[PDB]
Amino acid sequence: SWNSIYEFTVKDINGVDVSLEKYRGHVCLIVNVACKSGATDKNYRQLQEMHTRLVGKGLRILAFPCNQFGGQEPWAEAEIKKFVTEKYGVQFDMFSKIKVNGSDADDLYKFLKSRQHGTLTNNIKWNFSKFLVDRQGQPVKRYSPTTAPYDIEGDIMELLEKK
């Protein structure tokens, strides 16, 4: 019964309910994030740089805080928002904290994982895994946590050239 990301609603980091219909016709990069990890700086800085350069062409980065990996996203939303804006100047879209694995995972992630399977198992492996979603809301690629955002630029460019 699930067919595209536009059918799902999630709370943004300010506690407001957002239908992902907002993103219709744009290329989305969906990332589970954490503030207290050794990988935090590199992921956030590359994502913010790519956002600045590519938002005009249609890139929409969605960042979902998740505390399931080493307890590395413990803070409340206000504190997460303050941290990422002060440290990285994040201008892309931040969401409220969710689970990405288990039976209480957000429906969005249950959908993403169904459409783009993992290796050995479908669980998100660590902080900062990435899913790429095309201009029709279809998940088309999944990347490991250690895939740098810049390594996804070519795939993003390919989809940004599609109608």
Curated annotation (Swiss-Prot):
Active site (record annotation): S37
Q: Which InterPro entries match?
A: Glutathione_peroxidase, GPX_AS, GPX_CS, Thioredoxin-like_sf
The Gene Ontology biological process terms listed for this entry are: response to oxidative stress
Instruction: Please state what class of enzyme this protein is.
Output: oxidoreductase
* Induction notes from the record: Activity increases significantly as worms mature in their host and is positively correlated to the resistance to antioxidants.
Catalyzed reaction equations: 2 glutathione + H2O2 = glutathione disulfide + 2 H2O
GO MF annotations for this entry?
glutathione peroxidase activity
Q: Which UniProt keywords apply?
A: Oxidoreductase, Peroxidase, Selenocysteine
Is the keyword Phosphoprotein in the record?
Answer: no
Q: Which Pfam families match?
A: GSHPx
Enzyme Commission identifier(s): 1.11.1.9
Q: Which CDD domains match?
A: GSH_Peroxidase
Domain of life assignment: Eukaryota
Query: Which family does this protein fall into?
Result: Belongs to the glutathione peroxidase family.
Q: What is this protein called?
A: Glutathione peroxidase
Organism name: Schistosoma mansoni
